[PDB]
């Protein structure tokens, strides 16, 4: 699932609603 994707560990925020 996406919770498992290894990324840099930054918080992600959406750019639109």
């Amino acid at each position, epitope marked *: 699932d*996406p*919770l498992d994707h*290894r990324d840099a*560990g930054d*918080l*992600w925020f959406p750019g639109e*609603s």
Partner: antibody, heavy 122, light 108 residues
Framework: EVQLLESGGGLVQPGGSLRLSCAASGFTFSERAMTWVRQAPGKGLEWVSSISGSGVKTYYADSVKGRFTISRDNSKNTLYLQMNSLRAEDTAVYYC???????????????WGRGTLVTVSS | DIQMTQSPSSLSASVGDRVTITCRASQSISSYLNWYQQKPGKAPKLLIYAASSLQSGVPSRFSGSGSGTDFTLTISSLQPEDFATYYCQQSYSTPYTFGQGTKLEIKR
């Protein structure tokens, strides 16, 4: 396998200080953002602070900005909340939580510790 | 901040029942809404993320949906282990905010 365990906390006077610690096991700590959430007695959940995996980016609730500092030690798998100028607003169980934050998902508190109690009183 | 209002605050239901808990945002938050479950004397656990996606190990009787300001958590066929307090939580923006909680108790 995966575990988070909070240390620290206890009773402090208004104006006082504490340092909470959260020990991570069973995952690659440096790859994961981490969060502190608190829960006042008989009340709901309130987000306190989050920190990027790298430790470079921090985020705070307005009520704790410039009193609390979130930090981490990637070398020792440890997340901290340094607390200054405490007030009774701050009395609560504090939980650390692993925070995956995928693209087109956002932050999710997918694993939580057991909680530690902070009491602020004269 | 983005105010999250859950409805109802308190809900009594029985095993087998279908219940719906609502979560409303004070502004659009797209689908960035998570749900947590909390039993007495225990830390919360993740149930659902991004409105609809089930956490590993969460039964299919839990479903969520919504986008914008209105969201639903539906538990079909309530089981004894499901009685707990439920919170929604928006991840659209910091500060991350939670609903006030919905205490789901068992009827007898």
């Amino acid at each position: 396998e995966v575990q988070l365990l909070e240390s620290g906390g206890g009773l402090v006077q208004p104006g006082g200080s504490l340092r909470l610690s959260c020990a991570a096991s069973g995952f690659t700590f440096s790859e994961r953002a981490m969060t502190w959430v608190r829960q006042a007695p008989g009340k709901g959940l309130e987000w306190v602070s989050s920190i990027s995996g790298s430790g470079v980016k921090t985020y705070y609730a307005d009520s704790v900005k410039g009193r609390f500092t979130i930090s981490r030690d990637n070398s020792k798998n440890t997340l901290y909340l340094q607390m200054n100028s405490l007030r009774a607003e701050d009395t609560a169980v504090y939980y650390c939580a692993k925070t995956p934050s995928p693209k087109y998902v956002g932050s999710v508190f997918d694993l939580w510790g057991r909680g530690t109690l902070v009491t602020v009183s004269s | 901040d983005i105010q999250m209002t859950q409805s109802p605050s308190s809900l009594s239901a029985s095993v087998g029942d279908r219940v719906t808990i609502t979560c409303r945002a004070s502004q659009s938050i797209s689908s960035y809404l998570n749900w947590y479950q909390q039993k007495p004397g225990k830390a919360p656990k993740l149930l659902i993320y991004a409105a609809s996606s089930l956490q590993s190990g969460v039964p299919s009787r839990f479903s969520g949906s919504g986008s914008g300001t209105d969201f639903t958590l539906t538990i079909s066929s309530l089981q004894p282990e499901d009685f707990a307090t439920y919170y929604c939580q928006q991840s659209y923006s910091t500060p991350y905010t939670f609903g006030q909680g919905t205490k789901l108790e068992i009827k007898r």
